[PDB]
Amino acid sequence: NQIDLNVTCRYAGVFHVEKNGRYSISRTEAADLCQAFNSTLPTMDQMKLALSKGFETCRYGFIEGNVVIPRIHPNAICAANHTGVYILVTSNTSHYDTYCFNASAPPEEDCTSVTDLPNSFDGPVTITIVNRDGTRYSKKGEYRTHQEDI
Numbered sequence: 001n002q003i004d005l006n007v008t009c010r011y012a013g014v015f016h017v018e019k020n021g022r023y024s025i026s027r028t029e030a031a032d033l034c035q036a037f038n039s040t041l042p043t044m045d046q047m048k049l050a051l052s053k054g055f056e057t058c059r060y061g062f063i064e065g066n067v068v069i070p071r072i073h074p075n076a077i078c079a080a081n082h083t084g085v086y087i088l089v090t091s092n093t094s095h096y097d098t099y100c101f102n103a104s105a106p107p108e109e110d111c112t113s114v115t116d117l118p119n120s121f122d123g124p125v126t127i128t129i130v131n132r133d134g135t136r137y138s139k140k141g142e143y144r145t146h147q148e149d150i
């Protein structure tokens with residue numbers, strides 16, 4: 001009973017989380033996941049400031065109200081070569097990654113490891129935070145509050 005959470009550097013507090021390295025987070029699970037990181041889903045204004053500080057990914061993820069990919073460099077296989085905060089308009093499907101915003105993060109780029117899920121609650125799941133440099137932090141707990149997500 002295990003969940004891996006792949007996390008990025010923070011840029012102005014905003015980071016990206018992938019569950020088990022595949023698109024697999026529902027909108028409800030996204031909110032619970034950010035809450036476990038003592039974070040919230042970013043607003044579009046928070047995401048645009050993060051973008052300005054160097055944040056980009058090649059993955060769709062929830063923010064408050066939309067699913068987006070932040071892009072700095074045009075790449076043909078990421079967001080159809082767009083730059084800026086690219087907003088997903090048309091999809092059949094409901095599961096993506098998530099973005100999260102932690103107000104206590106440094107103001108610009110923070111590429112130190114993420115070390116904890118401070119607001120996870122008691123539970124049976126081994127949850128592992130996986131940083132891009134491979135550093136891992138694990139704890140037993142739970143973060144999902146909706147049955148439909150378990």
Ligand SMILES: Cc1cccc(N)c1N
Pocket residue numbers: 006007008018021130131132133
């Ligand atoms: C694939 C992957 C593994 C660990 C951390 C991150 N950010 C990513 N994208």
